[PDB]
A paper describes a structure:
The α2 interface hosts the ligand binding and catalytic sites that are well-conserved among ThDP-dependent lyases. The overall structural analysis is based on highest resolution structures (1.70 Å TbHACL/S and 1.85 Å CcHACL/S), unless indicated otherwise. The most unique variant is CcHACL/S, showing a clear preference for C3 over C2, and no activity on C1 substrate at all. C1 substrate may be too small to interact with this surface. Curiously, this variant clusters in close proximity with the OXC sub-family, which shows clear preference on C1 and C2 over C3 aldehydes. Comparison of active site structures and ligand binding for CcHACS/L and ApbHACL/S shows relatively small differences but comparison with AcHICL/S shows much larger differences consistent with variations in substrate specificity and kinetic rates. All structures contain well-defined bound ThDP and ADP.
One such enzyme is 2-hydroxyacyl-CoA lyase/synthase (HACL/S), which catalyzes the reversible cleavage of 2-hydroxyacyl-CoA (2hcCoA) into formyl-CoA (fCoA) and an aldehyde or ketone. Originally identified in the mammalian α-oxidation pathway of 3-methyl-branched fatty acids, HACL/S has demonstrated remarkable catalytic reversibility, as it is capable of condensing fCoA with various substrates covering a wide range of aldehydes and ketones with different carbon chain lengths. All the enzymes are tetramers, specifically dimers of dimers (α2), where α2 dimer represents a catalytical unit. The three domains have specific functions: the N-terminal domain binds the pyrimidine of ThDP (PYR), the middle domain has a regulatory function (R) and binds ADP, and the C-terminal domain binds the pyrophosphoryl group (PP) of ThDP.
Residue numbers in the entry:
A (entry chain A), B (entry chain B): 6 to 543
C (entry chain C): 5 to 543
The structure:
């Protein structure tokens, strides 16, 4: 028994079956011990992507993802994923090797107080003091990351413990089911009365709801009482985007005109403009597991402190108790004229003359037609970029829960390939399509070798406008000192990157090439990159 | 006048001429304001590389490099380069946009306390409170980064200031020459007397000595009195690797046998094994600008608190005053049998059977022959990896000061392309060769597009053994759960990445093809990638 | 046969530590007792605030780190006040904190706190002893770092499992190492000399970095050979006497504004100098400091002299001697005489103010100065703390010797009064320590009178009592409790009677005659004396 194998056995007793990371001094022994215990190891090319993958994996699987890094710069690179998981409220454990304990203060190799470096990004950050305490620290990180509001944790394994030996196996952690809570009956009763008296109720469904896996309870409630709902971006698909009660296509109007809003796992942070655009007379019912979230940015009527799935059901039962036959389809019907105006605005983009290239909307509309016909809603989507991501949110539909990851609460670029790895590993029998802007893609592009090596046959679609929001179409005549900050190199051949990893690449300039390229990606055993050149202009 | 242009005018008045970064919300207007003031902007593909480039550029240029990032995850990604510059003692300024000030606490877009996030990685971290204080904060970061022991600083620009306008130009910073200091005369005289009584003195020359640009003084001293010297890795070349007084080829014996060691800008940290292998009877003279560095890890005899170049010259004048002539060539000559024994050990690697692929030594010995014939030492070298870096240090020689950058005090992977950009921008008339392991390369490989776009014709040599220290030559038959953590995909075709950016790539498997490929890189107007497949075994 | 306690103690003793301030508990009492067994005196205080304040002041006074010892958790948190103080003042000290058992971290251990992190932003070095063999390295690093360069506080963490661990092998103990200093570059030095050579109105601004570095003899030689006007900051008062013929302190504002050259000697252009904002932009500034990050930040300077203050003064002096010109800048001091007289007339207006029937601040402190002047002729030790009390003490109570004055300093912190007095009395057992404090200031640390009585430190405490913070009420009996003003304390609180709690002597004083009589009884008393001086309560 070594520090490595006790760490590995502790993770194994808690059900960990895949770890992302990059090895070296001193943690290669830790990774090989985990593999020796039957835990798969996904070696990445940058710890940014490894720690993004771990966080997304935790969100998808409702249990902590695990990331493993070397000391010093390994952990510092992974702070990007700690910050990401903390913002997204996603469970994960970052395990970092650290320098020899008795060399701290001497300028040890990759010396860093890594517990302190991670403390403000995590719900728990701690160091294994000795071999006997390894299970305790691992278990504490595991339990804490998944409890209450989920988030990341940090576990430090100093070099002198990794290679330390013992003959006595410390008591290993045993699984513990996360206890949850329910709203107080008084609050739940008041919220039920608010809904009963409402004329225009609106369920706002966030990624806390999809994480908690409330899709069945939400569907039963929405469909029995015709309750309009509106998903946040990663909640798209919890019910299909084309569901008859989905108000997503009239988002701004539905929010302004609703007289009751039920927030289901969604915060009134920047994504909801802090609640500033809500009618002050709207009554707000907030369902969250973090009680510190209630009545901060915006006055709310009722805070329902409880688990989303059971809370939906309790509200649904409350409405059934009266025996009355509530229906709010009228509110959804009232949003129909605004939905048709928004559709008419989209059509103007779709019929714009070719430049001779397509614009964002024309390219992504073709993608949606192709993907819809091939998969009928059953695949996995990763979405990242600026204009590429917003247009993908409008045009590329979701039909199942937790089949969509995007830049999230941070609006972080660089999650594309890590999230796609996590998605493919969670759904080995499904196709994973990652739709990325050309700028976004360059943050994590080298993980295509990780995907190829780990037999993850990703489909990568790059919407390429030669820069950030827009670009130049010729830089050879621009004096280098005056090269604008937003442009990338015109017609960068991201498609040819696929050949470095024995994949397949396609350069696409028109809808015919786009359709034909995508048809060749559906059954390819490897990485496909579709590099779609679009109009560079703003 | 905006926050953006007051920032840009402040940097320009302090002589800033190039900035690395990535733009977005809310920092696009800042980069464009810098460009309008005549400051060149290098848009990168990940903030890791941009912040590594700024720190390298500061070291090479003896004034702070500048890195610009967006709020939240932009700054967090750049903490890797802060940590790196702090560890290397390199001057730089990280300029981060941040969220609207009156939205802190509300879950603003990319909300992060960025002053605090950067506080422990920097000599100064501060926020611009209003338009009037921007020059003060910029000037403070600039002066602090380069004073004393150099290091990184952080300047926060909130989004409400970036967009703020005024008609009053604040007083702009004026350049100020960094004050140096000299050792106390009593300590200097004691150090001179120690050297006069020495029989086997050794000058240990670190990258503080190259940063302070002491090559002229060092040469004069070494050659007049025949004083053996030993460079640390990035000090290689301060005098040529084949200089007749260079003890680098008998490094452990020279350190073991010296009766006096003069530490010139080098720490007794992990790179010197904390001084643990030095003879306890060896007298130690330590020249540093950081007095907190003296007499911590190892008992020393004299701390010379002073600027390295002037201190070398004062020691030299002190020896020259005595009239009695000094020559320590005998010490160097005593090292020759060990130099020879080390060359014969190297020769066993160079003549080892081919697999049919070369080993690290055979590949890099060929690279050195080709580079030496072409440039006669006059080029720029970046070196990154584990075995690849160690063998490059042994075999690829340096002949001029500050023409070599490697993984440094952190042993950090991922600095390769960022260091190459800074080196090429500092020496536009020289060739930049980056010798990277295959694992190392994957951390920063997408910056080849930055190099192509900004007209930086890098020559990239990848020493490819299919993984980290070693790899497998076949993963097709390995069950995915048992894939080892150290391996990468066999024969990943990094050479083909060059085609994505209209460069040129070469797959190379023997010394003949390596020489032929390298000869085609010397005058190519673009990025060249030579992918050298070597034996995968450990 | 050695323990963590004794390896720590022997490590401190080999580095010359001879006194430690602190408060013991679990398990650090074994550490203090091992220190006492090695010949190190332990000063047990009543609050860690005062202990850490005392350690920092002791460091300043003695030009070597003071040492503070506390228990885990709230012991260390209480001492962060003194770390912040020593950091702001640039004073060398080591805080030594016990911490919880290492293998209980994360479990909710008794007084569990990441104390290394807690102290990190307040210290130059914060570290933990990982095992018995590394105690000397950590202690030595804290000791060397605190005194090198710009001095400052450090933190050493001693976990409970280490305090109690035993070994039969003695680790190598630290050996003393003389702090290396630097000298300014010759180019900068020659440029500074040439600036001074061409000056008509030069001014040496002498700060507490100058007094810490002990440059009084070099400064005196330069000032007196060439008649160079100078101006001390509050704790530099006395480096040359307040009544030295070249002292411009009585015309501070005019001298600063009219100088054509300012030499800053261990003084910063921080809030205490209004950030340089009142200086004439045409004035040339020469800044002598050991922290190069200080140059050209708040204010444009001409020359940064990166070097040790005493040698740098001497090198400037020698540079002026080299020409053979008989430089004399007494004329600039003489130009300040109208302003000095105007300020003295302003003060005399306060001294002749009618009694109310109580004295005002100026009258009480002028009487104090008359008594102290007749009793000591300048040779005593002064601690000064308060708001108005402190400002009037600075104007009226004179200093005549270097490092004989401590006040609220860079933090303007209330609560240093008795800890500083303890350090001053321990540093000068052959001198009398007078602490002049406002009534509000005194209440922060007053219980340390028992520490002084217990440790045979015969402090003389003078409280200038106006019933509150800057001002007070003279009656609160008829004020409804909800409406009691925030600035007032209880009228005529009998701080003098506190002296009886520790077998000292106290005096209630309401006029200058009683003040004189009471003070005269304080100079030869074996114990603590407190003079409670009731003054006018109005603003
Ligand atoms: N099981 C659960 N029950 C209730 N609320 C939860 C649960 N898990 C997470 N949450 C909450 O869901 C919220 C997620 O909000 P956010 O990440 O802003 O979603 P979105 O970005 O989709 O609006 C967090 O406030 C979190 O506390
Ligand atoms: N101008 C200078 N004069 C003296 N010392 C310097 C100067 N600039 C930097 N230094 C010192 O040089 C040292 C660099 O050492 P280190 O980075 O460990 O070098 P290496 O890795 O080459 O051994 C630091 O201690 C730093 O304080
Ligand atoms: N030996 C020394 N040589 C030169 N400067 C020093 C020395 N010791 C301390 N200093 C400097 O003295 C200055 C003290 O300034 P400060 O505390 O503001 O003084 P004051 O409050 O009296 O104005 C600090 O900047 C510190 O770096
Ligand atoms: C880590 C990080 N760095 C920088 C940014 C700023 N940013 C926001 S979107 C974006 C890229 C936008 O370009 P692209 O992905 O090509 O999309 P487009 O809008 O051109 O379709 C960038 C760099 C960010 N959000 N995160
Ligand atoms: C940021 C970071 N992550 C991980 C490591 C661990 N590490 C050390 S060397 C190395 C790469 C070794 O492989 P390669 O560059 O191919 O060199 P080889 O030894 O195979 O020649 C890695 C990942 C590191 N030093 N820094
Ligand atoms: C630790 C701390 N708490 C509070 C303050 C605020 N403060 C400044 S001066 C002062 C006391 C002023 O009253 P006193 O000491 O009686 O003097 P007076 O001006 O009334 O003569 C206080 C509380 C401080 N400086 N430090
Ligand atoms: Cl745009
Ligand atoms: Cl190996
Ligand atoms: Mg784009
Ligand atoms: Mg390799
Ligand atoms: Mg008062």
């Amino acid at each position: 028994l070594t520090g490595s194998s006790i760490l590995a056995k502790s993770l194994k007793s808690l059900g960990v079956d895949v770890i992302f990371g990059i090895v070296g001094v001193p943690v290669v022994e830790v990774a090989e011990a985990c593999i020796a215990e039957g835990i798969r190891f996904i070696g990445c090319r940058n710890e940014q992507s490894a720690s993004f993958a771990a966080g997304a994996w935790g969100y998808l699987n409702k249990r902590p993802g695990v990331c493993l890094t070397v000391s010093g710069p390994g952990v510092v690179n992974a702070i990007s994923g700690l910050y990401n998981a903390q913002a997204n409220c996603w469970p994960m454990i970052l395990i970092g090797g650290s320098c020899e304990t008795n060399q701290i203060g001497m300028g040890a190799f990759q010396e860093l107080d890594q517990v302190d470096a991670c403390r403000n990004y995590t719900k728990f950050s701690g160091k294994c003091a000795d071999l006997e305490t390894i299970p305790f620290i691992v278990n504490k990180a595991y339990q804490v990351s998944k409890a209450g509001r989920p988030g990341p944790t940090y576990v430090d394994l100093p070099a002198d413990l990794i290679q330390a030996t013992t003959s006595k196996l410390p008591k290993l952690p045993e699984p513990f089911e996360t206890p949850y809570c329910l709203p107080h009956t008084k609050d739940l009763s008041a919220a039920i009365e608010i809904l009963k008296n409402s004329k225009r109720p609106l369920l706002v469904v966030g990624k806390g709801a999809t994480y908690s896996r409330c899709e069945n309870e939400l569907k039963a409630l929405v469909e029995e009482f015709n309750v309009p709902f509106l998903p946040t971006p990663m909640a798209k698909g919890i019910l299909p985007d084309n569901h008859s009660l989905n108000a997503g296509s009239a988002r701004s109007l539905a929010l302004r005109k609703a007289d009751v809003i039920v927030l289901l796992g969604a915060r009134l942070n920047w994504m909801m403009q802090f609640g500033n655009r809500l009618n002050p007379q709207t009554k707000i019912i907030h369902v969250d597991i973090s009680p510190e979230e209630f009545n901060i940015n915006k006055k709310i009527d009722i805070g329902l402190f409880g688990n989303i799935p059971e809370t939906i059901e309790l509200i649904h039962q409350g409405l059934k108790k009266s025996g009355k036959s509530y229906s709010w389809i009228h509110f959804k019907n009232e949003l129909q004229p605004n939905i048709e105006k928004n559709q008419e605005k989209l059509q103007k983009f779709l019929t714009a003359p070719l430049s001779p290239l397509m614009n964002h909307q024309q390219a992504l509309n073709t993608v949606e037609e192709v993907l819809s016909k091939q998969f009928n809603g059953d695949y996995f989507l990763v979405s990242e970029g600026a204009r590429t991501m917003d247009v993908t949110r409008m045009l590329v539909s979701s039909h199942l829960p937790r089949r969509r990851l995007d830049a999230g609460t941070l609006g972080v670029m660089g999650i594309g390939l890590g999230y796609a790895l996590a998605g493919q590993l969670t759904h080995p029998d499904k196709k994973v399509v990652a739709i990325m802007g050309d700028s976004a893609f360059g943050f994590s592009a080298m993980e295509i070798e990780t995907a190829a090596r780990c037999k993850l046959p990703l489909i990568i679609i790059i919407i390429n406008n030669n820069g950030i929001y827009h670009g130049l179409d010729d830089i050879k005549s621009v004096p280098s000192d005056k090269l604008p900050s937003f442009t990338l190199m015109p017609e960068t051949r991201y498609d040819l990157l696929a050949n470095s990893v024995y994949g397949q690449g396609f350069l696409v300039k028109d809808s015919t090439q786009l359709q034909s390229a995508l048809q060749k990606c559906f059954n390819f055993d490897g990485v496909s990159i579709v590099n779609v050149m679009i109009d560079h202009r703003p």
